[PDB]
Structures are given as C-alpha cells and as structure tokens.
Amino acid sequence: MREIVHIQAGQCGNQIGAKFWEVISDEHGIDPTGSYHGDSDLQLERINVYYNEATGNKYVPRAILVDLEPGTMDSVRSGPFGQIFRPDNFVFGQSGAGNNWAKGHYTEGAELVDSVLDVVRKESESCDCLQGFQLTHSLGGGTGSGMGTLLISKIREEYPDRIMNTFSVMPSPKVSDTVVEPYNATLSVHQLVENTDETYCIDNEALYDICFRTLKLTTPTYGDLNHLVSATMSGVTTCLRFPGQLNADLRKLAVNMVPFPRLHFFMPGFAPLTSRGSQQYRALTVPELTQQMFDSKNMMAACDPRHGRYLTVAAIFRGRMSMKEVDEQMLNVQNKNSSYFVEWIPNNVKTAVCDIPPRGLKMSATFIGNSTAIQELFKRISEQFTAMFRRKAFLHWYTGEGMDEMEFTEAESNMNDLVSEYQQYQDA
Amino acid sequence: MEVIELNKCTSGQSFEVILKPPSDPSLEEIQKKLEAAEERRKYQEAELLKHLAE
Amino acid sequence: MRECISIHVGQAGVQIGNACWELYCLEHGIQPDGQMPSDKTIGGGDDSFNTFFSETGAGKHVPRAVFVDLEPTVIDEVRTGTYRQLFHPEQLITGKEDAANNYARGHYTIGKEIIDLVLDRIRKLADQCTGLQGFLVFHSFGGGTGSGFTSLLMERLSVDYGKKSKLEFSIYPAPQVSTAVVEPYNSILTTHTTLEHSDCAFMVDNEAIYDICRRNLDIERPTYTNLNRLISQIVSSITASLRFDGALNVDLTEFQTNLVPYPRIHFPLATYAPVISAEKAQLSVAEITNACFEPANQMVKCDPRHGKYMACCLLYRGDVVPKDVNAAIATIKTKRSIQFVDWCPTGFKVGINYQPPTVVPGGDLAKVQRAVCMLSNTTAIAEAWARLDHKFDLMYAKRAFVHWYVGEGMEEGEFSEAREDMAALEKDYEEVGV
Amino acid sequence: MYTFVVRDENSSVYAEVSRLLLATGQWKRLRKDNPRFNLMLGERNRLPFGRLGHEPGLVQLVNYYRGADKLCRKASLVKLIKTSPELSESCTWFPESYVIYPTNLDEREVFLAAYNRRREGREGNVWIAKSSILISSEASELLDFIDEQGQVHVIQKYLEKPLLLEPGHRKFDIRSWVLVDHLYNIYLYREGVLRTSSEPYNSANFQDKTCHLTNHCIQKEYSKNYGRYEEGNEMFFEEFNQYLMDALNTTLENSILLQIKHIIRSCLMCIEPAISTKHLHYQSFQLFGFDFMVDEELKVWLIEVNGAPACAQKLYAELCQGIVDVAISSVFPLATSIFIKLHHH
Numbered sequence A: 001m002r003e004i005v006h007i008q009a010g011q012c013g014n015q016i017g018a019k020f021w022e023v024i025s026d027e028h029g030i031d032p033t034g035s036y037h038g039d040s041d042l043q044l045e046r047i048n049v050y051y052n053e054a055t056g057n058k059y060v061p062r063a064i065l066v067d068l069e070p071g072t073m074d075s076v077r078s079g080p081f082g083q084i085f086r087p088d089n090f091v092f093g094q095s096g097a098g099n100n101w102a103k104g105h106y107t108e109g110a111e112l113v114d115s116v117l118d119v120v121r122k123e124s125e126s127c128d129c130l131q132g133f134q135l136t137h138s139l140g141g142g143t144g145s146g147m148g149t150l151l152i153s154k155i156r157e158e159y160p161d162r163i164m165n166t167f168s169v170m171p172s173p174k175v176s177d178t179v180v181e182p183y184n185a186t187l188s189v190h191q192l193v194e195n196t197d198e199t200y201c202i203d204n205e206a207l208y209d210i211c212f213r214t215l216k217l218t219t220p221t222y223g224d225l226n227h228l229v230s231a232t233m234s235g236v237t238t239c240l241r242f243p244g245q246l247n248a249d250l251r252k253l254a255v256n257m258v259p260f261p262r263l264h265f266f267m268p269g270f271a272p273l274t275s276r277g278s279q280q281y282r283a284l285t286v287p288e289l290t291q292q293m294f295d296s297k298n299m300m301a302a303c304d305p306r307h308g309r310y311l312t313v314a315a316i317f318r319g320r321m322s323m324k325e326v327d328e329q330m331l332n333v334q335n336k337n338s339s340y341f342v343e344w345i346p347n348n349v350k351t352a353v354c355d356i357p358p359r360g361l362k363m364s365a366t367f368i369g370n371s372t373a374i375q376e377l378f379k380r381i382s383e384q385f386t387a388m389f390r391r392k393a394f395l396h397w398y399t400g401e402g403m404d405e406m407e408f409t410e411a412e413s414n415m416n417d418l419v420s421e422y423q424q425y426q427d428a
Numbered sequence B: 001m002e003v004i005e006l007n008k009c010t011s012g013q014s015f016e017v018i019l020k021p022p023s024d025p026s027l028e029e030i031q032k033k034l035e036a037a038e039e040r041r042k043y044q045e046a047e048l049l050k051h052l053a054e
Numbered sequence C: 001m002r003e004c005i006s007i008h009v010g011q012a013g014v015q016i017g018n019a020c021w022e023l024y025c026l027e028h029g030i031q032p033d034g035q036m037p038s039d040k041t042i043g044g045g046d047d048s049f050n051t052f053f054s055e056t057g058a059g060k061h062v063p064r065a066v067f068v069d070l071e072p073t074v075i076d077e078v079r080t081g082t083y084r085q086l087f088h089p090e091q092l093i094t095g096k097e098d099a100a101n102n103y104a105r106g107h108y109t110i111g112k113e114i115i116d117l118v119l120d121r122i123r124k125l126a127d128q129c130t131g132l133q134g135f136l137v138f139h140s141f142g143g144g145t146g147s148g149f150t151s152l153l154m155e156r157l158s159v160d161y162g163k164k165s166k167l168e169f170s171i172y173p174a175p176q177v178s179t180a181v182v183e184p185y186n187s188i189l190t191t192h193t194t195l196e197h198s199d200c201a202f203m204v205d206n207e208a209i210y211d212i213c214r215r216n217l218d219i220e221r222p223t224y225t226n227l228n229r230l231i232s233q234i235v236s237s238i239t240a241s242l243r244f245d246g247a248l249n250v251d252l253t254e255f256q257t258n259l260v261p262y263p264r265i266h267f268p269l270a271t272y273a274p275v276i277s278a279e280k281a282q283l284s285v286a287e288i289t290n291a292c293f294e295p296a297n298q299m300v301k302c303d304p305r306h307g308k309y310m311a312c313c314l315l316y317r318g319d320v321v322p323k324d325v326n327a328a329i330a331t332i333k334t335k336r337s338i339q340f341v342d343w344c345p346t347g348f349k350v351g352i353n354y355q356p357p358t359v360v361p362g363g364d365l366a367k368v369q370r371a372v373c374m375l376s377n378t379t380a381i382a383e384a385w386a387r388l389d390h391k392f393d394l395m396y397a398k399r400a401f402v403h404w405y406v407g408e409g410m411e412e413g414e415f416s417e418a419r420e421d422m423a424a425l426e427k428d429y430e431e432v433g434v
Numbered sequence D: 001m002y003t004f005v006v007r008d009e010n011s012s013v014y015a016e017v018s019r020l021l022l023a024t025g026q027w028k029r030l031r032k033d034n035p036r037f038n039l040m041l042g043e044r045n046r047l048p049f050g051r052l053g054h055e056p057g058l059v060q061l062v063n064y065y066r067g068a069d070k071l072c073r074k075a076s077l078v079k080l081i082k083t084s085p086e087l088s089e090s091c092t093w094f095p096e097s098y099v100i101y102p103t104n105l106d107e108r109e110v111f112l113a114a115y116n117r118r119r120e121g122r123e124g125n126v127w128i129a130k131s132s133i134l135i136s137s138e139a140s141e142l143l144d145f146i147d148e149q150g151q152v153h154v155i156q157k158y159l160e161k162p163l164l165l166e167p168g169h170r171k172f173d174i175r176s177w178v179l180v181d182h183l184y185n186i187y188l189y190r191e192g193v194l195r196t197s198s199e200p201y202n203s204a205n206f207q208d209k210t211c212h213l214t215n216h217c218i219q220k221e222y223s224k225n226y227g228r229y230e231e232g233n234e235m236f237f238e239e240f241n242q243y244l245m246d247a248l249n250t251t252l253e254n255s256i257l258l259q260i261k262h263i264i265r266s267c268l269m270c271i272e273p274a275i276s277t278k279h280l281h282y283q284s285f286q287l288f289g290f291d292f293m294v295d296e297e298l299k300v301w302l303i304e305v306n307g308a309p310a311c312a313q314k315l316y317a318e319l320c321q322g323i324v325d326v327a328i329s330s331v332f333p334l335a336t337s338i339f340i341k342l343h344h345h
C-alpha cells in the first residue's frame, strides 16, 4: 500500500495530467465514472498507488488539480474523464499568473498555496504508507513553473523524508508562448535542482520534431504532443502501477538512477513511433523496439546522447514477448555503443518487462536515461536567458512583483554550475 | 588411503579418508553507533529546515 | 538434542526460507497443517528433527524460525501460503517501508527502530529450547535489509548469545537478476561488519544458480522460484546432518571445526551434483563425485585448480556405500589438481544419508537415486571477493551513490574502513593459497 | 562488432595483432579498464583472471593460460619435470638440472652428490648457473655466485658437445613458436629461427660468454663478428635444412623437428589438466616460445619455455595473422595453414 499523491499545476500541467489519468484509467480498467470493468487481476493489484477506494468499488484518482485561473480546469471537468476526479481536489484562483514566474511564486501563487497544501495534507493523511509526490507542470509559464516550484518547496518542508518527482516540460523557441519562458525556466530549474529527487525533462521541441519528422504529422497540435507525453508517462510509471521487481517504488528508483544528488534530470523516450497507413499494422519486434528506443530522434529532451554519456539507464518493455530476446537486444546496444555508457558504474543499464501493454498495442517500450548530454538542454536555456538579461529586457514584469536583479543573477549562476557539473562527469 | 572413524546407523554412515598427512562490541557501544548516526540525520534535516525557513 | 533457530532477513532470505521449510516438511513427512503421523511422541520429544521443529500439544510441528522484512508484501506470501498453518504471527515481523537497497537505511535508520522487536521474537523461540546451538541466518548481500539489518542483528546476537554459533547462507549479487546498482557497496559494507560475528558462511552466487538452471534444467529465463528450489536443495544437503541421525556435522560447532581452521577464512565453496531436468524423458558414485570438481556445478564460479584446499566434506544422499566413494576419490586424485595447504591433511570427511534427495512435486528437478554436495574451503573463492571489490572501487573513486548512505547518517569513513578490511581479507587468502 | 582491450603496451606481438583486428573493421578497441570486452590482450604480471567470464552475454577470451607460468619459469620448469610422472626425473630430453636457493633464504646436497660422481669418473663436469649466468666446471664457484644473489637459481649440466655450424665453428639455439587455442589444439608455427653465435666456440674459456651464450641481445653487443654469416645472427629453416643436407646428409625434419614436436607435445599435454579452459566460464589461448639446443649427435634438448615471446622481425606479419585466424577468429568469426597441428588424444 505505497501510495503516490499526484499534483498537476497550470495549463500545461493540467492538460497533460488529464490525458495521463485518461490513459492509465483505461489500463487499470476504470471507466469515466470510477467503476472497474476490467478482466485481469493485474489491473487492481497495485491500483492503490494512484487510486483511492470509495464506497461501492469506486476508484478515485489521488490527484490534485491546481491553477491560478479557472479556464483549463473547467475544460478538464468538462472533458471525458473529468467526472472521475475528486471535486474538492480542484483548487483554483481567478487572477491568473500572466506567464510570470514571480506571480506564481511570490504574489498570486502565495495567496493560493495554503489551500492546495490543505488538500495535499488531507490526501496524505489517508495514505497507509506514502511514497511521495508526482507533479506535472511546465517551466515556461507562470503557474506551473512559479507556483509549482513554490508547492514543491512547501511540500518538502512538511514532508522532508518523502520522494519528490516531477514531469517538467522545458520551453523551446520553436514551440513558444512568450519571450519570457527562458526567465521562468531558469528560475524554476534551480528550484528543481534542490528540491526534487527525479525530474523527467520533456522538451516541447523534441515532441514537435518527433510528430513532424518521424510521425509525418504536418501540423502537430498540443493535443498530439500531450498524448505522446501521456504514453511516455504511462510507460515510465509501469514499474509503480503493476507487479514488478525493478524500480518498484520511488525511492529504489532514485537510488538506482541518481548517483549524484543534483544530477537527477532524466531523458525519457517511447517506442513505437509509427506513421499511420500501410506499415502500421506490422507486427513489432523486440529488435525494432530497442533500436527505436535508443535512437536520438526518438528522445524527448532534444539532446544528442552521442554528445554525452549515460550514467544510468532504465528500459521497460510492455507486452507478451521473449524476456530472453529482451536481454539479448539490450546487451547488444551497450556492447556495441560502449562509448556512450560510463565505465565507473558497473551494470548501469537495468531492464524490466511488464505483461500488460498499452491499449491497442501488442508491445511497447519506454526508456529512462540519466545522461550528461542533458547539459545541452540547460545550455540552450542559459544562452536564451543571457541574451535577454544582458540588456535587462522584460525584467520590469518581474521587478514589479518584488523581485530584484540579484535573484536573476543567482539563478543564472546556479544553472551554469549545473552545466559544469555534467561536463565534469562526461569526461571522467 | 586410510578410512578412519567409520560410524554406521540405520539412516546412513560417515567416515574420513586421509590420503596424505600434513607437513566483540558491547550493547552500549552499538547504541552509541546507532544514536550517533541518528544524530547526523537530525542535524542534516535541521540544516534543510533552516534553509527552507530562510 | 540441541535446537537450531533459523532467521530469514529481507526478500531473498524470506523466499529462500519459505522454499527450505517446504522441502524440510517433504523430507520429514510433515503435512502443511503441521501434523507428522510418523511422530509417535505426541507433544514433544528430542529426536533429530526436533532441532528444527518444536511440537505443540495438539501434534503440530512448528519451525524454529523467524522471518523479518522491512516491507510486508513478501512475508504476506508466508501468511497465506501452502504452509501458512506451520507458523504463528509472533514468528513473522514486518515493517512499512523498506531499506531501498540502501545498507545505511537498513542498518541505522530502520534497523534501530525494529531491532528490539526482532530480538524479542527470537528470545521467545530461544526460551523454548533446552540447549540452543545457535542460529542459521539467510539474507542477500545486495538488498538494503539483507545487508544492513542483518549486520546489525549479527552484532546484537553476539551480545545476547555470546556462546552460540552463527552460520550464514548469503546470496552474492549477480547483474543477470540484480535489482540495484549499489549492491557492491552493500555487499562490502555488510561483509565488513558481519565478518567477526559469523562462524561459517555459505555464499551462493545468483550467477551460478542462474546458469545451472539454464544449462541443466533447460529453463530459458529462470525465476526466483526456479532459483530458490535449487538453493533449498543445497541448503537441505548442508543442514541434513543437523536434522537426521548421523555422526558428521551433527552440531553447528562441527561446521567450524571441520571447515574453518582460519576464522576470517570462513566461506566454504559448495558444489552440488546431479542437477537433472524433470522434463527430461542415472549417474554413478564416481560420476557425481567427479562432477564436484567442475566449476560449472559450483555455487560460486571460480577455479579451485589455482588455489589451495584447507578442508573438504562430501555429503552424499541416496544409494551410496563407502567402498564406491573411496574408489571415486582415488581415481579423481590421479586426474585432478587438488593441492592442500602444507599445514592440513590431504583428505576428505564423508557423510552418507541413505535417503535420496526429496523433490518438490511438479518442480523442475528430476528425482535421482544419489546426489552429493561437496563443502570445500578453498582459497579460490577469493575470486568472488576480487570481483566485488573491483566494482566497489570503480564507483567509490567518483563517490557515486555515496550521498544516499551519508544521508542516512552513515559516515564516508565506513566505506574506506570496510574496503580496507576486504583488502586485508584478500591478502589473507593470497598468503594462504599462493 | 567485436570489442577488445590492450593491457600490455610493451608487447611486440600483440601490437601487431591489435592493428590487424582494427584493419578488419569489425573489431573496436576499448579503454584498458572497460570490462565489456570480448578479447583481453592482458598484462604479463598479475593478470586479473578472477574477473573474466562474468559479463552477461559476452563470450570472453584472453591471450594467456592461467597457470602456464609453471612451464615458463626456470625453477618451476625443473620442479615440474622432476615431479610429473609424464616427464619424470629420468626425462631424456631435458638437461640434468637442480634448484638451488641462496643461503640467505633446495637441492644443494643432491647436486653436489652428482657432481662428485662425474669428477670421480673422469667425465666432463661443466655446469651453468642461471635464474630469472655463470658457466664453470668448479662447483664452489657456481654456489658462491648464487649466494651473492637473492633469488632462486638453477644449476644445469652444460652441453659441452654442441652441434657447431660451419664455417665459424659456432654455437646456436632453435626457437619454435607454438600456439595453443581455446580447445587446447597445439599449433607449431612452421617457421623457426636459429639464434647463432658469431664467435667460434671455445671450450677452453667459459669466462668469455659470447661464443657460449647465443642470445640475440648478447651477440648484438659483445660479438665483434655480429652479422658476418647471417643477417642478425638469425638463420631460418630453409637455410638450416639445406645445410644439414649438404653437411650431414640428413634433413631438418628427420634429425631435429621430430624431437622438437615430441618435446612440445609432452610439456603441454602434461599441464593440460591444470590449465585447460575447456569447461571454464572464460577461454584462454597463448603463444609460447620453446628454446632448444642441439648436440653433435643431433639430439635435441629443451632449454626453456618462454610465455611472452617475441618473434623474428621478418616473421611478425605471418605469425600474427595466424594468431588472429586460429586463436581469435575461431571464437569470434568474421563476416594452406602456416601451423602444424600436433595431434594428441
């Protein structure tokens, strides 16, 4: 009975969080009304990790929906699975955060955060044994970035010995909302370096390029990007939701994946990435799933892993397949590309298999990599930050909320320190 | 090749074959170790909470 | 009659313990409800099997066992398993959250909170004993509980039972089936703290069992159930002399006496034969004895040709007479490389039990007419320490994962202290065998 | 794609093996501490055999047989021959030898008893003392030389009647390269070399050790006639076989190679149960250099066995290709043999 408390904050966080709960509710056989209509015992064996039990076999997500404006959470509540969430777990304000980290972190968000913590406390108090927390959000906006990292700081103060885990969407100029996203992401990344144990880095540019290049989607939408994240989130949390021996809980996963406290930002990946039509019903093979999983084009951080080295790797295969062939193909990726795995962490590539594949697929695979190539992502953000901050451009939006320039200078320094830390271990 | 100490019972037997002759911390100390480690955990947590209070 | 108490720590210790007690019941004719129709002394006795089983007035035969794990799911399988009626709740101890493959968490953080309850439950078993011999401790090297809590328990048992012997069955980590990357840390941390507290430790490398299950059982991807039934056969061969009539290894002290002349060098190599597939639609005494000198049949892969022997015990079960054993040893001497140290007699202690090995019905192991387990104290097993110490060195040079341990209140100096002790152990093996 | 590591940078032979593997495009060289290798070209001293064969899904091979040192050390070879019934103290092709430890730390009284027997019976009584070299006919001068050192030595009967090449009246020795693969097939390279002395053999002066010691390093520095008769004091088999035909009316195969093959096979079959990797979790192959002396009756004597031998300069390419072909590619296959298989069963 190791429970996880899920939190989704802001527009991006709630739209991705809604699709995630839609995807896994289908996997666990939970309909939009919270009723179980599955056909397998595996669907219910570890369902308490994400769902509470209500009166009459009703399963309710242990999820908390947070925003500073009502719009997106009104859409969630009107969506397909919107009726399944606890009504009291909707915590929203009215003013918005105007894509401003300071508003989310210091002014607008500060007025709302205590009521969010009341709901978090109520959910934690019903946990037989709380693992920790899972937060979905973006770093480029105001609520998910600013109020999201404010929530992490206050949760760590109240639950200092619980695991804190995030799925964090990194901004990119290619798929951008406002010019201030590098400011918001740089301020948030420093919060994440200090107060999370695992962060999955989801780069919107990589998601876009995957939809355009590999999937042949001419004009991708946020809906297409979010379904790709939901599939990836379903795969990475398979170890938590179904019977398994590897990374069975959040703390063992972190012990296995994080050799240095600050280097805890993972590059995820998903397979299959298939274009529609013709070669779409083709039976997938483990060799094909494996080659896709480690191809750079299929990773969602827009970092070339050949420009760095993996510290640790967790690969999870879903479906009825040959675990012998899984071992062979996995040992064939390392033993052929040994230049891209560090040699001072023996056996740093772990593989797990789960028999339940995502709905409508015979098999699939998700990849979790702790790679020093992720410094490329932080370098991009740091460069875009400095191009504006050197001229103090758009700073008045933040100084008007009470911040001063010194705080920006420190966040910049911290991320350049993080980049230097990754480069140290890439040459070890 | 000598067989010595051949002992036989209903459930089996045993013998020996020689082919060639030849040529703690106290309870008090454990508690201090465990309590000293607990002290270091509590110090590190107090430092974290001081950092979050700032 | 003198009693033995079994302690099973962590997931590996509990599941192997569960497989062992299943086999013991089949070997002794004990039904899952605890009854034993061939036991005519209702309510008590001092037979050889009473070393492992006490008796209630209703005729139930209860293992002298305690199961400890820091999360409840594995011991819950005992509570609801086939032999659920053997055990009473006081024998099963569980916590809420586990050690997370972290020695420091199992030894310091959680171990401190649960150690007194474990000792209390052990004291309740010990108070049922008229002349307790000591303890048999089952655990993994790599798990946070198996490594961390076990070493705390061994220290405390030396304080509470100073005159009592303690034997280990330890599962050496293999990446083929391993969960964590930090298992070399946990293995060396727990070996250092347990070393002065264990009289004789039987190491089982999961790599060796995994390969015996692929090669000789034709199981493509062995499971823990496959591994644990083969391990329990080897364990049963080792403890059979404590549970049956005999004259060899009849008490725990004799294990140290016959296998460990050098107290720090107390890790005998086990070799077992024959392992025959039950799906396969009979070997001789000479052939099973010769198989004892094949690395492919050892519980730890190493080359005894390039080490030296200090002690050798042959434990046969089945249709075996002494005449055929001596003929086998003579032939094997003139073919194999069996060098003893100069200060030990070149010889073998042989034990024969006429009852052939019992097999779990529907299991993977075929029923054979004769089997043997060789316990040899050879310096070759130091290869397993060399492998383990090298993986430790690769990670510790960058202090990888160290923060997880320091964060639980452990000091960095315990790493180097433990590693220096292992370096000395490797030097001790080199001075003896080379 | 196969991977290999290099852990002996001073190896003439396997520097060429390494470049040949890379030239096939199907072998990648890794850092010397990367454990994910198929092939280890290991170090000479303290090779970590204990760490081989434990990488899941990797067939692992190493270019050394653990325990072959027993054959490739001066003192160990003497002890191996005297204690192995296959070889025995009455072995006819190895000179009478004795292991002598210096007094600051043994077969002293055994050697002196045999020395007195020769001095009494008017027989030649010249011995040689060598270890990890002094040629003398007085036992006291041989023992005092060993006491001045601190390592184990061997005293060996000096072949007072060597076969001398003409012209020059000069001593030599024969080097044979032998490759034992992972299946314990014994392959004798068909090309040997004669390391010859360029100075006339002088049995009346064992103080000048240049006409007595045929080592290539000794001839290149001390012999003032170095290279007069053959390039680098190296005579190959074609010339030597032609010489035996012209001068002694016989062939190299009949008068010498039969004994050489017999000696190679006796030594390696003797230690096979001790060093074979037939059922091991890793595999070994190794290249050996056997050293022979020939007396004037065309009897072949084993002198020593080298475990990390160098090769003749003009024979590196051929031999190192054969190592890749029968020892490495046989285990890791790619996408008229130069060896002579010495059969045994």
Ligand SMILES: C=C/C=C\[C@H](C)[C@H](OC(=O)NCCCNC(=O)c1cccc(N=[N+]=[N-])c1)[C@@H](C)[C@H](O)[C@@H](C)C/C(C)=C\[C@H](C)[C@@H](O)[C@@H](C)/C=C\[C@@H](O)C[C@@H]1OC(=O)[C@H](C)[C@@H](O)[C@H]1C
Pocket (backbone or CB within 6 Å): A023, A211, A215, A223, A224, A225, A227, A228, A230, A231, A272, A273, A274, A275, A276, A277, A280, A281, A358, A359, A360, A361, A362
């Ligand atoms: C644009 C591509 C759309 C689909 C491509 C071809 C891939 O889909 C498949 O391979 N489907 C298998 C072939 C069709 N099979 C069936 O119709 C079918 C029907 C009934 C049973 C059945 N088998 N079973 N059971 C299969 C799909 C796996 C993609 O590779 C993947 C990238 C799609 C994802 C995750 C997101 C895209 C970008 C979105 O646009 C999304 C809305 C499109 C399709 C999804 O609905 C897609 C879904 O998504 C999942 O979450 C999850 C992995 C699984 O349910 C995924 C089928």
Ligand SMILES: Nc1nc2c(ncn2[C@@H]2O[C@H](COP(=O)(O)OP(=O)(O)OP(=O)(O)O)[C@@H](O)[C@H]2O)c(=O)[nH]1
Pocket (backbone or CB within 6 Å): C009, C010, C011, C012, C013, C015, C016, C069, C070, C098, C099, C100, C101, C102, C106, C139, C140, C141, C142, C143, C144, C145, C146, C147, C171, C172, C173, C174, C177, C178, C179, C180, C183, C206, C224, C227, C228, C231
């Ligand atoms: N042979 C065998 N090995 C096991 C079994 N269970 C776990 N292991 C091994 O033990 C190591 C993992 O340790 P566990 O015993 O699972 O860990 P634990 O002692 O429960 O400690 P925590 O779970 O960290 O609190 C790995 O090397 C596994 O391969 C089993 O049933 N049989």
Ligand SMILES: Nc1ncnc2c1ncn2[C@@H]1O[C@H](COP(=O)(O)OP(=O)(O)CP(=O)(O)O)[C@@H](O)[C@H]1O
Pocket (backbone or CB within 6 Å): D095, D128, D130, D156, D157, D158, D159, D160, D172, D173, D212, D213, D214, D215, D216, D291, D293, D303, D304, D306
């Ligand atoms: N018993 C003996 N009788 C006659 N000559 C001998 C001899 N022992 C050695 N020699 C000669 O002395 C030389 C000594 O070399 P030796 O075989 O002892 O090993 P080494 O380590 O000195 C060099 P190498 O590897 O070339 O043999 C021989 O090459 C040979 O010329």
Ligand SMILES: Nc1nc2c(ncn2[C@@H]2O[C@H](COP(=O)(O)OP(=O)(O)O)[C@@H](O)[C@H]2O)c(=O)[nH]1
Pocket (backbone or CB within 6 Å): A009, A010, A011, A012, A013, A015, A016, A097, A098, A099, A100, A138, A139, A140, A141, A142, A143, A144, A145, A169, A170, A171, A172, A175, A176, A177, A181, A204, A222, A223, A225, A226
């Ligand atoms: N993948 C994805 N990214 C989004 C979505 N909505 C917004 N974003 C990204 O998130 C950032 C804007 O943050 P947003 O969540 O809209 O602001 P907030 O509501 O104040 O947290 C920008 O980088 C957008 O590109 C979405 O539905 N999916």
Ligand SMILES: [Ca+2]
Pocket (backbone or CB within 6 Å): A095, A111
């Ligand atoms: Ca307000």
Ligand SMILES: [Ca+2]
Pocket (backbone or CB within 6 Å): C039, C040, C041, C042, C043, C044, C045, C055
């Ligand atoms: Ca009774």
Ligand SMILES: [Ca+2]
Pocket (backbone or CB within 6 Å): B024, C158, C162, C196, C197
């Ligand atoms: Ca003791």
Ligand SMILES: [Mg+2]
Pocket (backbone or CB within 6 Å): A010, A011, A012, A141
């Ligand atoms: Mg928004």
Ligand SMILES: [Mg+2]
Pocket (backbone or CB within 6 Å): C010, C011, C071, C098, C143, C145
């Ligand atoms: Mg456990």
Ligand SMILES: [Mg+2]
Pocket (backbone or CB within 6 Å): D304, D306
């Ligand atoms: Mg030499």
